[PDB]
Each structure stands twice: as C-alpha cells, then as structure tokens.
Amino acid sequence: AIQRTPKIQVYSRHPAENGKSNFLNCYVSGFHPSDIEVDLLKNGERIEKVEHSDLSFSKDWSFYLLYYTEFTPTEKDEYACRVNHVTLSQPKIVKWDRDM
Amino acid sequence: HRKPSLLAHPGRLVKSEETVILQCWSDVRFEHFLLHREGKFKDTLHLIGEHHDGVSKANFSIGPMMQDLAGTYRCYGSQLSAPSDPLDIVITGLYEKPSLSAQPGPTVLAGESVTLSCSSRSSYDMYHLSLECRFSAGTFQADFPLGPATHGGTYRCFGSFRDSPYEWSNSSDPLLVSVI
Amino acid sequence: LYNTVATL
Amino acid sequence: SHSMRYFSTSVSRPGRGEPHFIAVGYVDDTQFVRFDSDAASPRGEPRAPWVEQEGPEYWDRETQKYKRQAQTDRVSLRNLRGYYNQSEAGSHTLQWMFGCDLGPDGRLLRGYDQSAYDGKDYIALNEDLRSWTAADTAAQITQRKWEAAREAEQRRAYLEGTCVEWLRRYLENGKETLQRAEHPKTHVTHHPVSEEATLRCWALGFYPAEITLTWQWDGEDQTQDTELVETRPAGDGTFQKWAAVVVPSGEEQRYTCHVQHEGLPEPLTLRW
C-alpha cells in the first residue's frame, strides 16, 4: 500500500590500495517492499560469489541490506552496483568511487 | 455411490492444542476416504480404508489444535461418492470465560419458566449454550428462554466474534438446573 | 531471548 | 544505557508457496541471532561470540519459538486479508518489533511493541504497557480481541522481567566487546576542483554508530557548506562516515575537523 525507493552507497571496507585484498560493499536502504535484486559488477559483467546480510528494518519500517564480496582493486578495473526494484522504472547502476 | 457418516471423538469442541478423531465410516467397502474442510485454510486429507468388525472406516487425527484446523468438515468415499453430512469443528479457550446465570433461580418448580443469560465485559458478538443454541449478544449479554421446566441438567457457555465463527472463548463455569 | 505472541 | 531489540518480517507469496519469515536480534548495535524459514534446516543461529556457548537446550527452545511465530504470522496475514477485503492473489507484508531499554542503573526505562501492515502502522502497545493504540478500524478488531484475551498482561510480563534479565546476562557474558568502545581511525584527504578545493574528514572502524563530524574555520563552526553522508556499516561490526567541504585554495590550513565519539577520551581536531 506504500512503496519507497532505495538509497545506494558503494564503498570498500578498508582504504583502497591497488594490489591488495579488500571487500566491495553495496549498501541499499530505505526501501519498501523488501523484494529486491542487487548485483555486483566487475567491468560490466556479473560477479558470482557474493553474499548479503540478514534482513532488518528501521524506525520508519523501511528495510536495509548489505551486499559484499572479496575483490582486488587494480587501476584499470571498473566496479559498480546494479539494483532493480519495483519502484524503479529501469535498473540503476552506481559506479564505485574510491575517494567516496 | 452413497454418502458416508462422519462424527468426532470425543466431540466437536476442541480445546486449544488438544486433538480429536474425525472418523468416517460406512457399510460400503470403500477403498479410500477423503476429508475436506472449509474455512480460513482449505485442505483435503486422504487415508486408506480399514475393514474389520462390520464397518469400513478411517480414523483422521487432527492434532495440536490450532486456528487453521477449525471449520466445516465433509467426507467422501472412493470416482468419489456423495458428500457426508457437514460437521463444524471448533477451537475453544482462546478468550476469557463469560458468566452464566439463571434469571429465576438454578432450582425451580415443575412448570415454572426459567431463563439463562450469558454475559461478559468483552465485545463478544454472539454466545452459545450447551447441555447448540446461539444468539447474538445485543456487560454484553444474551438471554436464553427455556420454557416450562421438565428435566434440568448442566449448562456451559462460550462467546465469539463474528468474523471467526469457529473460534470460541473459554467455557463459563458450569451451572446445574434442578427441577424439583 | 525471543518471545512469541497471539495472532492478529 | 543499553538495549535489546528484535525485528521480524513475514511476506506472503501467492502461488510461490507459503509466506517467508525472517527474524533478527540485536543488543545495542550488535546483531547476535538470526532465523530464516527458507533455509534447508531452519534453526536459530548465533551471530555473536557470546551466545555461542549457551547450550543445545537454550538454542532448541529459541528455534521452536521462531517456528511457532512464523506459523502464527501465517494466520495473521490471512486475517488481515479479510479485514481489508483484499483478494488472495496479492503479496502483503507484516512487520513486528519489540525490545527493552535500560538505564545506567540496569533497571527498566521503557518498553516497545508495535506492528505494521504493508508499510503502515497497524497496532502498538502504549508506553503504559496496559493499553493499545489502533491505527484504523481494522486494527480495532485486533484490539478488542487482545483485550478479551488478557494479552497486554502477558506482553508486559516479558518486557518487565524476562527481557530485562537476559539483556543483563548478555551484557556480562560479552562485556569484553559490548561494553568496550572502538575509537575511530581518522584522516583527511585533499581533492582538487579547479583554480577552490575539497577537504574530506574520514572516520573508519568505530563502534557504536553514534558519532559527530564538524568542520570549522578559525574556530567558527562553519556548517552551511559541509557535505555529509549517511553512516554506513563496514561489514565487520564497525561503521564509517565522512564530512566534506569546499575551500578557496591556500586557505586549507585554516580549516579544522572535530570528532566526538564515545571511544575517544576527549574530542579530536585534525588539519590537512
């Protein structure tokens, strides 16, 4: 009866330094319903060994989740988060900025 | 073929989380029996037929009584046969008990009229009397006239809400009517 | 500790 | 000043099977339990070290309460369908949250208990722990059912004693981590714009999530031009945050960043 659009943040666990093991995070929050698909992309294609946290919700009854994976950042490699929700007219891709 | 018979052991009213036995039986030697229930959650169970001692039967056990098991049950013998007489199975003990009182008095004279009445402080939409009888509660109460007295007994009583007629309150304290 | 309650 | 909170969600999928039930538990900002009905062997699982040694008896009982409540929600979703005269082909959501709140002395402060249907308030226990507040005429049906069932007494009993005792026990078995703050690891980065510049205050690896980031200039709380992002989890129990500002080039050394956090003995001050 009510629907909310998700908020996305793409970041890493530890400060990014090329040639080092880190974790790539995609944090979606503030959405309703909880039916959502989030995908992590390395240079346009799908990553496959990706895990996510247990479903929870906030004070305003909106849900939040975190999708993460193992990865090694290397100079000429692009990363992005792709999420599709019933609220969005088309899938939204958000690119990783290592200064944000 | 012909419709079977359906009855409950020990009865229709089931305390919460207790069990009953809905037993179908007939003189026709059916191979299988089906049990169908109408209500919030519809189901259809089936069992193999037992043939011993002059009756063909099947014992359906509806255990840990919950709200999804309350409804109207019908029964079929195996194409299928005609449906058996309907039977309502009820959950009791989900709400606090009502008060049961006799307007003249619990002990009366033969020929005198007696009237029982069930009441509560909750918003029950109807009450039920057992010795069955049902009337709508408008202290929300319903009054039960029993007419000139003849053979009194023991009565109990339950309250319920109109959106869930198979879910009854707890049982009122039993009241004995003596006709001297 | 978790709790479980009545139905709506 | 600690708390224990639970979050449960039931989602119905017509034609896809039976509803999907998930529940999680928190002590302050630490998840410590989870249950998912879709798993191969549905059972409660520890997600913090201090509930890992509670014994098979403890964990079997939690599992059986989760399964019972997932079953209870299955009926509630059907009841709500009839209240609102909804058809049976749509997906609907039911949410529930409850918990304690302790003070410094370790005794109760206030309790919680509320529900929501399809993202809107439905019914909630009042702060007095004896009355209810119904959001619409459908919830008033649920109200007088619980009034006739003496249910508010049973909910007050949990929050006032059972919920207070076990949060205390959890707080002692895990005082090594629950009662020990982790200070943030701060640093400032310069990012050029064009002939102006941007200054970023970072803060990583802190717990709990309560923190304050403020930029300044020559001691004057300059906030208008301060970008700020939502506090985000790092993924290992800690959190992150950063604050940005834009500044004329050359004036960069006049701006200081101040951090307030529980794990710090006194507020910090940073310069580029």
From TrEMBL, chain D:
It is found in: Cell membrane; Membrane. Involved in the presentation of foreign antigens to the immune system. This is MHC class I antigen. GO terms for cellular component: cell surface; early endosome membrane; ER to Golgi transport vesicle membrane; Golgi membrane; lumenal side of endoplasmic reticulum membrane; MHC class I protein complex; phagocytic vesicle membrane; recycling endosome membrane. It comes from Homo sapiens (Human). It comes from the Eukaryota. Keywords: Disulfide bond, Glycoprotein, Immunity, Membrane, MHC I, Signal, Transmembrane, Transmembrane helix. Belongs to the MHC class I family. The keyword Transmembrane helix applies. It is a single-pass membrane protein; Single-pass type I membrane protein. The keyword Iron-sulfur does not apply. Residues 184-271 form the Ig-like domain. One of its GO terms (biological process) is immune response. Its main location: membrane. The chain holds residues 26 to 298 of 365 of the full protein. The lineage of its organism: Eukaryota, Metazoa, Chordata, Craniata, Vertebrata.
